Structure 1
Amino acid sequence: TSASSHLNKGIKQVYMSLPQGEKVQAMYIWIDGTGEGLRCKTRTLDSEPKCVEELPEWNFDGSSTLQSEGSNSDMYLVPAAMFRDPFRKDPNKLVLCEVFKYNRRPAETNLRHTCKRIMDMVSNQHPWFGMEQEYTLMGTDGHPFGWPSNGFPGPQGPYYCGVGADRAYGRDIVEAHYRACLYAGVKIAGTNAEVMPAQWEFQIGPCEGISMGDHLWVARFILHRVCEDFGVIATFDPKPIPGNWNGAGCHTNFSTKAMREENGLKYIEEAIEKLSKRHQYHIRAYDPKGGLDNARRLTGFHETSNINDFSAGVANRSASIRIPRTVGQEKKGYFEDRRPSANCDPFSVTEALIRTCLLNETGDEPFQYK
């Protein structure tokens, strides 16, 4: 649908075929001032970097990305995680970088820095996270891909986990994204079509601590890039189409070594009790705009929790926190926080799960730790 997609791709492929030689390419990817966005730039490295630590720091213009004022626009990218590059193949890498200010203080959307400190405090207990990112592939026009033009597809029902031309739209984009994630090392755990047509879900898990955020952000970047080649645009909006068509939510699974260990459902239920008390804090933490975006998806209908009221159940698809029945039967496992929106920053959601359940924080403001 995009002009770029229309460009002959065979041509680009023959250039990709050419041996690149000793020089290696690293894409430096960083979160935007908006906080939902991702930006990227490429540098040439003389030799393949064995580890993320080896990769050099780089700088970018903050004013263009809306992360700083003109007077000291420069911002610094510090490599945080390194993944293989699906797009260019090995030795090329994709680097996720924390953004730092001109004065070397973590940037406003560098939520990894605070989250990383929080994960380190609770590293002994091995908190693990899984997330279930939901997205709709929408053409350049902004209307979902494959929907009739100036129209709506047939009644909702056949599209969930659908097969066939009519049932599923953008499977190729999904297939490419999934393989690209495997090649990159992003821990994709599976994919499924979603109830809304043209809407899919990709789940990353089980990552441990800060890794969850890194993997999801890289997965999202991979999705956007794969989508760009096809010409479609992935959207993480909580309610992509207004109406009865389903909204997109990123349901975070959370477990700790104690919960996973036998008779750990006591821990699962203790965590849930803490979550209920800080529900306002969680809703704000879980989406970039503080809950306006999350509220659109969370209408209390279409199997979504109401955003006003916290709820917990076992095998209750709708309630804000659902313990799977199997986890309950096993008396050990994980619970699924279903409040986070699709546009949620993973670092915030993980950090808030740790802060509320493991660090036992109380009150609206996040704690400051020595």
Structure 2
Amino acid sequence: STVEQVLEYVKSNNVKFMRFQFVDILGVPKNVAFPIKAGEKGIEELRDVLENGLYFDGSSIEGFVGINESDMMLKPDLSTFSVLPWRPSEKSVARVICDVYTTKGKPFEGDPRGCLKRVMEEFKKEFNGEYFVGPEPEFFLLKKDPHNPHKYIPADDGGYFDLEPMDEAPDIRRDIVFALENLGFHVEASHHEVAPGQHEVDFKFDDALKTADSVITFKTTIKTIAEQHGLKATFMPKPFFGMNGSGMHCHQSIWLNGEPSFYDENAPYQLSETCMNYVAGILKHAKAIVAITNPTVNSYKRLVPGYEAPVNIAWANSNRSAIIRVPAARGKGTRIEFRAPDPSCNPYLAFTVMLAAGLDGVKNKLDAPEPVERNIFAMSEAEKKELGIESVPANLKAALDELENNDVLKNALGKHIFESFLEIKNAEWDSFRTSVTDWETTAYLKI
């Protein structure tokens, strides 16, 4: 959308209120709103903000600590302008996703959106490279427990691909897809997942920045649609013990000079050296990547040993027990699926680190290990050690320490985000590790 197209939309729909939206380091969306003043002057005052941005106090935004927090700037990305996706019939209100800039007019180093844009621009400028991601976020719908109102339980008792009445959210999944599709946030399959009250909405395999914006919009929209139905939607990775957690498998590829670089008709499995170097890079840096793609203490309750748990650092052409699975599609569709991520991650940061790790593999021409097709949960600890299969960190603190020692990720995220993320997350881990949990009370009050 061009400035002129936005101004004409504003005039035709009599837009009276505009939201400027951005994201904090933890991936929480944020927005400040302003009235649209009447008259060509108001249209001129809006053009000025749309082209040059608006000032805001970022001192209370998580991860935005720095000099001049009280006069930071929001620079609108007009490609994202639209009616609110979660209130699409209220044409008098609109929003635009923005990048964060400093008072000086330069991208703010602590901006997660600007971070992904930076690494993608560098890849485009240096290698004429494009980066595509197709994520598969899962989530649970919850209702208040009838026996205890203070607690939430899964909204239904349905299962994988189930139909109503066991599946109690076919209209909700349909409605979120309509809300996103209607405004260009392209999505693919939707269905009830394995666990009671669990669901999935797949996203189009697309430009990583568009994908990240689609994911942040989807998270707000599904939560508002759930509330209209008296339910709560959660992206907590493992809300209930004894049932599946929620993951966000990320299909991804890189194209160099307009060609699907991962494809080589004549190579083993039809996977190019570039695809293998990229896979090698993801595997090499996997222990550090998960600090960002699985950034909660609860993320590690899903990343626990099991038949399909994506905790084993290996790749496969069919094995779901590996952290990377390569779909059978070839040609333009050749891509790799990172299965470790969960939907609690900040998509802008998760996509940045996967690209940086894969590109480090390409840059250093890293050799990939042999694929592992044998189910890895079922093999012994000795068989794993013999095959050199390492696991991802067992908890958030272990992942943070791996990230702290990873210079490739530090360069990708930049010092501000890397240090702010480590500081906030070490404090989060400290809060959890000093707490007295219900597990402990149940296990030890009798001693």
Q: 2: distance between equivalents of 1:332 and 1:230?
A: 38
* Contact 1:128/1:207, CA 8 A, preserved across alignment: yes
* Contact 1:196/1:245, CA 8 A, preserved across alignment: yes
Q: 2: distance between equivalents of 1:211 and 1:240?
A: 29
Bigger RCO of structures 1 and 2 (CA < 8 A, at least 6 apart)? 1
Structure 1: runs of 5+ lacking an equivalent: 1-19, 148-152
Q: 1: distance between equivalents of 2:48 and 2:225?
A: 24
Deviations 1:265-307 (A, max 9, x none): 1233332122111112211221334xx343211112252222x
* Contact 1:83/1:186, CA 8 A, preserved across alignment: no
Q: How far off is 1:138 after superposition?
A: 2.1
Deviations 1:80-128 (A, max 9, x none): 3514323134575332223446676766762121221110122222221
SS state of the match for residue 206, structure 2? strand
* Contact 1:259/1:334, CA 8 A, preserved across alignment: no
Matching residue of 1:277: 284
1:143 aligns with 2:152: yes
Q: How far off is 1:131 after superposition?
A: 0.6
1:208 aligns with 2:215: no
Give the alignment's Cα RMSD to 1 decimal.
3.6
Structure 2: runs of 5+ lacking an equivalent: 1-11, 37-41, 145-149, 365-404, 415-447
Report 1:1-370 matches (<5 A).
22-32=14-24, 35-45=26-36, 54=50, 57-66=53-62, 67-68=64-65, 72-80=69-77, 81-85=79-83, 86=85, 87-89=87-89, 90=91, 92-100=93-101, 110-123=111-124, 124-139=128-143, 141-146=150-155, 153=157, 159-165=159-165, 167-241=166-240, 243-257=241-255, 258-259=260-261, 261-263=263-265, 265-266=271-272, 267-289=274-296, 292-301=297-306, 303-306=308-311, 309-324=312-327, 326-327=328-329, 333-360=334-361, 364-365=406-407, 366=409, 368=411
Letter of the 2:50 counterpart: E
Q: How far off is 1:71 after superposition?
A: 8.5
The structure number with the bigger radius of gyration is 2
Letter of the 1:40 counterpart: N
Question: Which runs of 4 or more aligned residues in structure 1 lie more than 6 Å from their structure 2 counterparts after TM superposition?
Answer: 48-53, 102-105
Letter of the 2:75 counterpart: V
In the alignment of these two chains, the number of paired residues is: 334
* Contact 2:117/2:209, CA 8 A, preserved across alignment: yes
Higher helix share: 2
Q: In 2 relative to 1, CA 27–56 (structure 1 residues): closer, same or farther, beyond 3 Å?
A: farther
Q: How far off is 1:197 after superposition?
A: 1.4
Q: In 2 relative to 1, CA 107–144 (structure 1 residues): closer, same or farther, beyond 3 Å?
A: farther
Matching residue of 2:376: none
Identity of aligned residues (%): 22
Q: How far off is 1:79 after superposition?
A: 1.8
Q: 1: distance between equivalents of 2:44 and 2:139?
A: 33
TM-score under structure 1 normalisation?
A: 0.77
> Which range is displaced more, 212-221 or 106-115?
106-115
* Contact 1:145/1:169, CA 8 A, preserved across alignment: no
